[PDB]
Amino acid sequence: SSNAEVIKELNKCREENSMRLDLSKRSIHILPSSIKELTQLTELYLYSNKLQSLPAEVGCLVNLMTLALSENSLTSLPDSLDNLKKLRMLDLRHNKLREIPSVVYRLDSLTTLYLRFNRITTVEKDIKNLSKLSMLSIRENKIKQLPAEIGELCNLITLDVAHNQLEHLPKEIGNCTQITNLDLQHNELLDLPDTIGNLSSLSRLGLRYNRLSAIPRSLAKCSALEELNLENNNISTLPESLLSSLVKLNSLTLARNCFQLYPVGGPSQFSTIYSLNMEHNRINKIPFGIFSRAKVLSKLNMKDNQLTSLPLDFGTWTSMVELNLATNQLTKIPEDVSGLVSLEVLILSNNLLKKLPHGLGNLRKLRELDLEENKLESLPNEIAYLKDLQKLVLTNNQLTTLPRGIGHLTNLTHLGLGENLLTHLPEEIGTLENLEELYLNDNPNLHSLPFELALCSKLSIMSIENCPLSHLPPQIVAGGPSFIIQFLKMQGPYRAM
């Protein structure tokens, strides 16, 4: 972009006396000093350019309120910006700064300051001069510690310091009582200050990917929290009565932390939570009656744990919609499962299940049932009642035959039967009118396919690898699933139709 275009637009802005000037996305390398004349400017946009400095004449724009400089190559700012006593927003993201430019600390009128994607390493104590600051985003820098003077930003509402190197938070942060969004994820925090509980207005607290070994109990004062995501830390236990005090908390994630037992605090500590994710831990037992007050608990994720049995109150979980028990040590499913009348998704992959209970047939709302990597010897006949079942994954088991009720899963689109010991498919496979995918790969004893498989008019993916299929002609089997479906139509009773 030629500079002469920029000069012409600058003249156009002068004549129009536009309170707004937008020079963004013009690959400007250097800016003309004539900018001095545009004293009427209240908004100046310069984002997505190649600027490496600003001219000191920018400080002449004493009426300027918004200055957007993001997505540049700046390393400093001219000291003349101190004249902008009306500047409310300063945007300096993706800009290759190594320190907050000193002139920024003197802009006592700022309410919004963006410094993302820069190589800033510390916030100096002069941050207190920005007493009117309500938005501070110093995300994605190399900051190792925050100054205690951060606590004088009493008007701060959102503090976004994610993807930094904070080891501890300054205890003074509690004096910022108007904070509602505190993003601290992808840091190296080792503990949280007890004064965090003074942020009584806090609704969003981002803590995942840090190194916290515990949570302060004073956090229980932050009753405005709606989501507590504590993923990827060392938390092994929660403070007693922490959960039961967060009466707005609807999403709890305690994943990838070192929990061996469920959090202490009794059934009342889950009474307001829609979703509980406790994956990748070492919990070996779900306590009896733990969800007795969890009237709105819909999603329970227990993947990658050490559950050896389900609690005997399992059937009481009427409200449950999605239950994930994958990568555990379960040897059986209690008949009580029939109480889960609202259950829609049941993930049981990577367990030690040999049989499924009769009660599996009462899961009238079950749509997805994943049973991959178990030791299943057979399917119960009641499988025929899962009329809303759409996905039935049975890969890597010891299944040998399918019950004739399998054809009653009229809503089934996915039937995964890979890595099993199947000898035949039942002829009722042909009533799966909506069957779209049928995986039969690695069935060493599947020597034939029923003619009725030709009635599955939507079947669009089928795996036959490492199946003998010896009752089918060698040329047809080598021709792939297209030729086998064609062969079963024309040699079967359904050709003339």
Residue numbers in the entry: 85 to 581
Please share excerpts from the published article on this structure.
To further characterize SHOC2, we determined its x-ray crystal structure to a resolution of 3.2 Å. Whereas the overall structure of SHOC2 alone is similar to SHOC2 in complex with PP1C–RAS, PP1C–RAS binding induces a conformational change in the SHOC2 crescent. SHOC2 undergoes a twist that is spread evenly throughout the LRRs, resulting in a tilting of the C-terminal end compared with the N-terminal end by 9°.
RAS proteins are GTP-dependent intracellular molecular switches that are anchored to the plasma membrane, which activate the RAF kinases through direct binding and membrane recruitment, resulting in RAF dimerization and pathway activation. Prior to pathway activation, RAF is trapped in a catalytically inactive conformation by 14-3-3 through its interaction with a specific NTpS (pS365 in BRAF) that is required for 14-3-3-dependent negative regulation, and a phosphoserine (pS) C-terminal to RAF kinase domain5 (CTpS). Genetic knockout of Shoc2 suppresses the growth of a subset of KRAS-mutant cancer cell lines and inhibits tumour growth in mouse models of KRAS-driven lung cancer, demonstrating that SHOC2 function is critical for RAS–RAF pathway activation. Here we present a cryo-electron microscopy structure of the SHOC2–PP1C–MRAS complex to an overall resolution of 3 Å, revealing a tripartite molecular architecture in which a crescent-shaped SHOC2 acts as a cradle and brings together PP1C and MRAS.
